[model samples]
Target: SNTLTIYNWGDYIDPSLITKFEKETGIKVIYQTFDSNEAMMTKIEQGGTTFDIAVPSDYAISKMKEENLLIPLDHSKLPNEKYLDPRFMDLSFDDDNKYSMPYFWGTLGIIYNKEMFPDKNFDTWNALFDPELKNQILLIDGAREVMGLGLNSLGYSLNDTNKAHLQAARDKLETMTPNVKAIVGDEIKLLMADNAGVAVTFSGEAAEMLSENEDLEYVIPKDGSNLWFDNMVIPKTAKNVDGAHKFINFMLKPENAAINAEYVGYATPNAKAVELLPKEISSDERFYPDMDELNNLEVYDNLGKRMLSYYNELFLEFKMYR
Candidate 1:
């Protein structure tokens, strides 16, 4: 009814979306950012902000829904729902997605400097752990993400939580650390764009890096990888549920979706929006991977409380020096 507060990942939205939505709906906008899904959830858990909307990745979405932290959506208010691919709507995290709206979709993969591994076989993830690339490899600074690559090297799902399986992944990471030069955050884009070694980054960042450097390219390592989706949901305590739904619908519009997708360099779940993107982006395999590639990807699921503690312990042990 008054102001609509939105909490989202940094650089995840089209900046113009704020002013555009406020002007179009006459609803004032309050925006803030969070570094990670876990951090954002902790804020909500501690009775932090009055954010009406949050854009979180799949596992976080699942975690919120499980805790009943999010409210169910009234689809009647979202006519643009048809714009999203029905398949993406049926998320592994939220099933039919009653608690959230699928916004962006992408995958995790290894980014390589063509000069570093020119003519090398990239179909597998083994490159990141190769003894030859010692002190030449870099991984995204997320535990589950990097561990997932370790799991993949052994032909395991990124979402696997089996004790033995997870420990195996941890063991793999410990061994690879000798070759890891650094664990970077958003720096993955800039560092790799200049053709500095290799990194395990998301699809959009990978595409951006490959486009910027003539000597860079990305590949979906054959074993398996994290197929990720970002969704928008209203917290159960939202003061302006109506406005939250309105904003979500607005973003779902084909034109609006296209702008955010193109501007942010992520894959749009809105099929109609895909038709609007430039071929250079939409047609790129890194951004819009085909089914064969899709088959090799898996959704990263929430590992739960006990599992979270377990993973954190192993990850901390492995990242001790950092």
Candidate 2:
């Protein structure tokens, strides 16, 4: 059996999984980690190493497909695809299943105190951008993520690359500066631990916070959002496509999916696996948001380098002064 080399996001999988897969399939996992998609994309583009499995989120997968860096799978070989949700399967990133399998899904949204927002509806981006709860906002530190919110608030695509649209997003962020308390990274979770008001956050952090506090809840903005999914794919340079397929199908098994989902605390795109989650998890609307809430959502695409440089420059301008 050939060894399967996996280049994936850091802390993405359950620890015991590699060993268990090794035991069952006799395919040794040579695991590598990446903290961000740009690093993983650049490393893969370097073309020095051949990876049998590469796990990338929705946007990176779109970029990968653009460069034709991944290989298409044979459904006949991956019978466990039956266990996944067709709803998530039809995501724009890999809707046709040309090259990827969704592992987990999450949405970018606002987390708020139930007590603070009791009478008010925090159902839209306006609630965070121009919130009723004044001076109690924490914007996540990412430029694209936060900028995407401004873009969506104006009823544009989350990944819109038009210059005027981006300029407007920058302007909106600048305007919102007075109301925003802090632009933060991981500390947003910690600050909220003591109960900050409304903060921009991802679904996973919201889920964890919900578990800890009875007064907290998360909501996807009514204007729409970014629907993100980390998925499994085989690289064009891989030597052991069969082994990679075996590994993915193995992970797709209902029990395996649940183990990963439970430990990770992210939404499982696996329909069968979701059924196995406890009520606390299964009942969280933020985790498995209904279509009515998700109808305005969009998956991010590779916005191209020139546009990205422009987005970065705009964010730098905002971050430095505001």
Q: Which candidate is the best by TM-score?
A: 1
- RMSD for each model, in Å, please? 1.8, 3.1
User: How close is every model to the real structure, measured as TM-score?
Assistant: 0.93, 0.84
- Candidate 2, residues 60-148: lDDT per residue as tens digits? 88778888898999878889999999877866778678798878888888888878778767777776655455677888776568778
Clashes (N, CA, C under 3 Å) per candidate: 0, 0
Question: What does candidate 1's lDDT look like per residue over 131-176, in tens digits?
Answer: 8887877777676787778788888877778889988988888888
Q: What's model 2's TM-score? A: 0.84
For candidate 1, which ten residues in a row score worst on lDDT?
A: 187-196
- Best candidate according to lDDT: 1
The local lDDT score (0 to 100) that residue 10 gets in candidate 1 is 72
Q: On a 0 to 100 scale, what is the lDDT of residue 321 in model 1?
A: 46
Location of the lowest summed lDDT over 10 successive residues in candidate 2: 125-134
